[PDB]
Symmetry: C3
Subunit: 626 residues, 3 copies
């Protein structure tokens, strides 16, 4: 009943939307006609968008294949994303506007204006530079959500050094593996982060990782907790000590890089394989992140914007730092979690900072729904004008809850669909679209998405199929680091199209619904975890011969991990050992990957080629749909 | 599962049904073949029915259009409905049969035979006549459910004075508006009515209404409560005082009126517009009400019949007074409510009077279901042989409850579909039809109903559409008073057909299901309320600039009213004020229209022509289906 | 969601299955290709199977019609089923293997090896023989589940005396009726049986039955309870007294009978008619029961097998005694019920005897589900490798429960479909088939089942219809005793096919689902009860003029009986009398037939030919689907 219902957009928002302005300026009133035009005129649309940023030198052609299916955008243009996040705002009123409203886990708080971030980024760049960091070099970051994490990212961008950010929830193997796949030259971390009152021993975990990461010349340590931590003489150095000798007036000018020079690497996972280092570049990524933020979140000069995701995920790259700073937004940045001190913390934040736009996980909403409707009702949420969803599809129940309690039965929900590989939002509502619960809606401009069968034949309205994109978009990944074959499979699994890796349905009105990952990859709390990362840390234990991880349904988190373990012969299968192997995974991969269920088994299903058939395992437990 | 199930009719009822007798007499055994015959032979069917009443002079032709789509039935026939309710029973055994078993709110009780009603009606007519009431004049009635309300209606009918009855639940604006649209000459009310132990200040509300109703020469006051009430010298007079000087043997002979002279006006509402004064006439209305009562409720000489609706609605016009008295039924007439003294009150009544046929609101059933299965079980309901439903479609859950507890899993449910405009039941089971829960069933004889799209093309089995009637029927309204354009839209919205205003579905077997009002008019407890009547009383308050009423789902009552108010600038939006504006609507329109929800808003959606788009408002709150 | 899911078979079972071995030996890897081959090559398949048993003399032709639709299998072959259950195991290691693990209601226990059963069966045969029992003679058995019930059945089989077993739950009329329809010559019963701690007065009920069974020359009484019971001098004699004079070395050689000589009669019921004495013969029955047991339950030499059904039903004939003994299985035989001493009793049994295969009623599972997941969890069920279902279709909820708690989310469920008339399982999974919850799956080899309409036209995938078999199978009934017309209707209701009497659906993959009995026969706890047996015992009461039994839904038992009684005129319809008529049915038909609901009514629906229309009765109560 509820999913099949259309919710029209509220008072004043359609007339004043940014997308309506761009539409009007090409002679369109209706999104549908505009959409069709954007398909024909994709290069022109993206030229318009990129013209709105500062370029050091302009580009020869909007798009071209290189050695198909590798490609390029804004060819020969020279650019620095960091410059459109900071430099160009200097000498303007926007220099004194707030860039980050930082909010610590304990309620401490500090606001940084764009000028203050410009200066802080310049000084961090100089510290990196003085160490020998230069264009091309991979800088690893393992940090809590604090200003110096933003400044560190932007400082890498301004040197032309690709950053590689590891979420702070990951433990030592995870951090080590990522740093070695990309041959990282230095590491920026902290003494620790705070999360729900407890200290997270970032530096001690970094120590366990760096000792098996031979490429690391130096570790920069932000002093955040203030706790005595180990500091290896020579390698490890406090950032604040170094910054003592870097004047306030210090300036590292942005390095003008090619529109296709690496901006960053961010590791994500399939259900098989070691993690994939997804590569994004400065030009196309900036333009895509900029345009989608502008249109989807409708950013205006008076807006305070809050995306609740960690910068350790693509969500926070694209829609905390890069995208929103290029619209000159005031951006909330929160160190902590939704439940500490208590489960109204998000609503305190919205109220504290008069937040206008919120973009959050449906995990978070399922989490807070448990604690009832009283908590949001205690706070003034009346500053919100746009809500949003990211990381997975949202059930209609939680959609209603979000709209009812957080949006007073009026506000729009931007239900978004994209992935690390896509770099930017691809399918999503805009303020001008009637909404349907649990629907990403219509594609964004130029994005030629469809639903096809194995062979790439359109399946037609109302039928479930593979969700493909037909033509590149600016912010798409260019490759997988050290491994181009792995990038190619995205284009060569179904002839001539990009294979998103999700199944989907498109209804009579063109609205897409996402039905989850095809590879049945384990997603926990919105995040892809590799079966292989889990299974390895289990086999590395002395007790364990083999392992297979699957994901099983979880009311709150999406799925949780269950693992099936074949022990060595002779080992007694105890609850004590179950607890021990859970501990093992926690201390190596991290809390988010730690199995909630575990079962000792004597055998596992294999191909005759010898690999674990994980689909069979899951189908034994849960059955396979036809 | 449950709706798709056929329940066959019990022991003995099919062979002895009235409809079976009429069928046999035209050579039919099966309702389907008969139905098809009734379409071809509509004029003959209705001639048969009308031949069973007393006519002063007979009619030239069964039917004819006048200035299409106005029309006429039994043309040139002279008739008085009141005569077939009373006069013709005199000098026969039926004069001593009970006509009304009146049952007061407090358990007091009195039975009137047809003779006693003849005499009481004659004497009330004479009082009206002596005042100057004559054929053509509109007599307003605002009364509780007591014998003198029946006698007052019939006395109007016998003078040829159209009655205009305002439900006693309506407050002063509502009563004033109705009296002024029809230019009412006098008012019959009471000092008050009892409802659930509390007094209803009918006379004080009448005083507030008459003071703005310049056409009223006189107010007749039944002394029912006995409480001291204000009586304006000259205008206001006690009925019992006047009746003191009217002998028992007094006789006002029925005025022989044309078969198309006004019987009454009854105001109903759409979602927009001021209330509509629906006009019924003596001849066709009598014949239709007579025939449908005879066939649907199977009335026999031994039957005690009870329709639980107020005479203030069309239900009580057609199927408490006129229809059942023309079958010489013994009729229960109850002043009160289902829950006082307690929630077995209906079942006390059934038992007290050995009621055979009950026709009630599904609101009432949803209401009593809350109080459990013990209450009906305490009483002897074994006298019932036929159950029925009116006012709205009944969910299958409450259908099962009605059949289980009130019908010992045997009795038929006459699930009826019609409206004030149609004057009589149109689609409904008869005793001979297998029943399906939540289905009005097959149309009654001559009634050519179908389901069509905007353009009037049949949509076919199993598909939702507009429910139309193809050809007039005897008891249909002839016009809307003072406003024939408004009557015409019923015929000119879809070419050449009557547009009922409800959506519907017809299954493989011909059974119709009703799916609610198209105009999304607010129905509360089975009753249409105008959005415009509510919204006006709100704007008349000093605090309120504009308002929009919608109906929202309600477990018991069908829907309740929520209103959205734009206040004047500067006015503080308080709970105190919310309470105050609820009070305002209660004291002007009445309890049934009083908003259960209310929301202060700064703006409302409008056409560019300036009107409130109420569909958008509702769709913002509840979404619109595709 | 859940029913539409495929569960693949576990580790090791497919490669080592018996069916895979037979398949490989005809050159097939896939069940589908094999199945199609089995249709063409039915005679060869059954020749292969029968070649695996001992024949006294071989057969001329696998199959032939006699006077169609009577037919025959393994024509002219001479055989004794008892010989393949016992004799041929003597002089081999299997003589010392356990044949029955008997487990009494009170926890007493005794194991019998095949040698010990050979000797016990020989000695019982001799006792019967010495009385004058000879080939052709009907021996009635009314016993609890104890070794001497198995030995008594086998002793009949070895003399060539058809056995007629009456479930011990049946009371005296039921037992008398069955014994008289078949003109039984002797009766083997016991002093009593134990069931849930209480004594069942078998012998006293037998006394009430035999006194109206003129054909009975002798009653053999097993001394099981030890309680003083009445013993009529001359007729009644203790089995143990007679066995005192029968040496241990006594041998009655198996009588070599024709492959079509009667093995047994077992009475089952439709919704109308007196009970039907279904006739099975030695040869085809043995081969079918043997083959289906071998393939479906995958019996290996190390297996302990447990079917929880009483031998009083076809289930225990086919799949406790005959089928499993012909695979040389070790078989549990339990006297009692699932709930005594408590509701873990089945799980104690599985653990006590390291049971490998369990075949049980879904009633039992619905029964035990009520008591929660703790009870099975207390016991070691780890010996189970195959689960199974019999008697009715199992809801998906209880399927999940069975697989989760009894099969640790791995074990297969053999969901079986067949009836007394079919003699053996017909549609069912084998270990090699992916399972779907609530689906019997694909037919067994040679079994040409389909879903057709009234006229026998295939209805096609996904549509509900009549479930027919196209060609006989070895273990099918040959006739109904004393009444061949009644056997013929099975073949002459739809031209040229066997009409199972169940409705069904076949999905895109060939998997059948059963949707219950067409005749709407009353099934209680998996067992067909005749409406006519119930209705008769009610009319035999002095108070009762007429009666009609229907079956109404029951959460646990499938359905329960409700009866509608027309009393004599003048009789007061009391709760006292309701209790009395329930008692009446209990003491004559038995506990399983005793009405849970009863309603006094004044009339019942009849044809004009005068019979009770039971469909109308049910449809008045519960409605009829379209
Ligand atoms: K490398
Ligand atoms: K007027
Ligand atoms: K006989
Ligand atoms: Mg190991
Ligand atoms: Mg005002
Ligand atoms: Mg009798």
């Amino acid at each position: 009943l509820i999913e099949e219902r259309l919710f029209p957009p509220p008072e004043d928002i359609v007339k004043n939307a940014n997308i309506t302005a761009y539409m009007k300026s090409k002679g369109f009133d209706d999104y549908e006609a505009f959409y069709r035009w954007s398909l024909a005129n994709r290069f022109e649309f993206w030229n318009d968008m990129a013209k709105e940023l500062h370029w050091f030198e302009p580009w020869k052609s909007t798009f071209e294949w290189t050695d198909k299916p590798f490609f390029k955008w804004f060819t020969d243009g020279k650019f620095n994303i960091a410059y459109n996040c900071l430099d160009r705002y200097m000498g303007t009123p926007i220099e004194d506007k707030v860039a980050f409203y930082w909010e610590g886990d304990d309620g401490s708080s500090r606001a940084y204006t764009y000028k203050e971030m410009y200066v802080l980024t310049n000084r961090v760049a100089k510290v990196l530079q003085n160490q020998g960091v230069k264009k091309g070099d991979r800088v690893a970051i393992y940090m809590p959500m604090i200003p110096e994490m933003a400044a560190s990212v932007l400082a890498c961008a301004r040197l032309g050094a690709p950053h590689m950010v590891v979420f702070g929830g990951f433990a030592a193997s995870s951090l080590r593996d990522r740093m070695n796949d990309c041959d990282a030259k230095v590491l920026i971390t902290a003494d620790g982060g705070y999360r729900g009152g407890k200290v997270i021993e970032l530096k001690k975990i970094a120590d366990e990782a760096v000792a098996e990461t031979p490429t690391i010349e130096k570790v920069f340590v932000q002093r955040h907790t203030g706790f005595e931590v180990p500091m290896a003489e020579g390698r490890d150095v406090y950032l604040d000590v170094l910054l003592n000798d870097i004047p306030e007036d210090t300036v590292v000018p942005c390095e003008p890089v090619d529109s296709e020079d690496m901006l960053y690497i961010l590791y994500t996972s399939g259900s098989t394989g070691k993690p994939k280092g997804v590569v994004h570049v400065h030009g196309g990524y900036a333009v895509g992140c900029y345009a989608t933020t502008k249109f989807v979140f409708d950013i205006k000069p008076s807006d305070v914007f809050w995306c609740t995701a960690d910068i350790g995920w693509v969500t926070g790259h694209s829609y905390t730092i890069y995208g929103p700073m290029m619209n000159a937004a005031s951006i909330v940045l929160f160190e902590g979690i939704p439940t500490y001190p208590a489960a109204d913390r998000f609503w305190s934040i919205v109220e504290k900072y008069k937040v206008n736009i919120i973009y959050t996980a449906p995990t978070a909403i399922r989490s807070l729904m448990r604690f009832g409707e009283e908590l949001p009702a205690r706070h003034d949420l009346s500053s919100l004008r746009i809500l949003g969803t990211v990381g997975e599809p949202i059930n209609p129940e939680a959609w209603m809850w979000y709209r009812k309690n957080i949006g007073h039965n009026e506000l729009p929900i931007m239900d978004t669909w994209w992935q690390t590989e896509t770099g930017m939002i691809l399918i999503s509502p805009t303020p001008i679209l009637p909404l349907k619960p649990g629907s990403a809606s219509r594609p964004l401009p130029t994005i030629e998405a469809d639903v096809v069968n194995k062979d790439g034949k359109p399946v037609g309205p109302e039928h479930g199929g593979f969700l493909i994109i037909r033509h590149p978009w600016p912010a798409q990944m260019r490759t997988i680091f050290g491994d181009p074959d792995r990038y190619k499979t995205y284009w060569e699994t179904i002839p001539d199209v990009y294979f998103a890796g999700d199944a989907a349905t498109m209804d009579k009105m063109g609205y897409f619904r996402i039905q989850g990952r095809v590879d049945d990859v384990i997603k926990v709390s919105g995040h892809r975890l590799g079966s292989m990362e889990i299974e390895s840390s289990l086999v590395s234990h002395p007790a364990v011969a083999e392992a297979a991880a699957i994901g099983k349904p979880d009311e709150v988190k999406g799925e949780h991990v269950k693992v099936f373990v074949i022990l060595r012969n002779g080992v007694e299968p105890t609850e004590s050992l179950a607890v021990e192997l859970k501990r093992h995974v926690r201390t190596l991969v991290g809390p988010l990957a730690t199995p909630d269920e575990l079962e000792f088994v004597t055998s596992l299903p294999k191909t005759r080629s010898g690999k674990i058939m994980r689909r069979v395992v899951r189908a034994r437990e849960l059955g396979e749909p036809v």
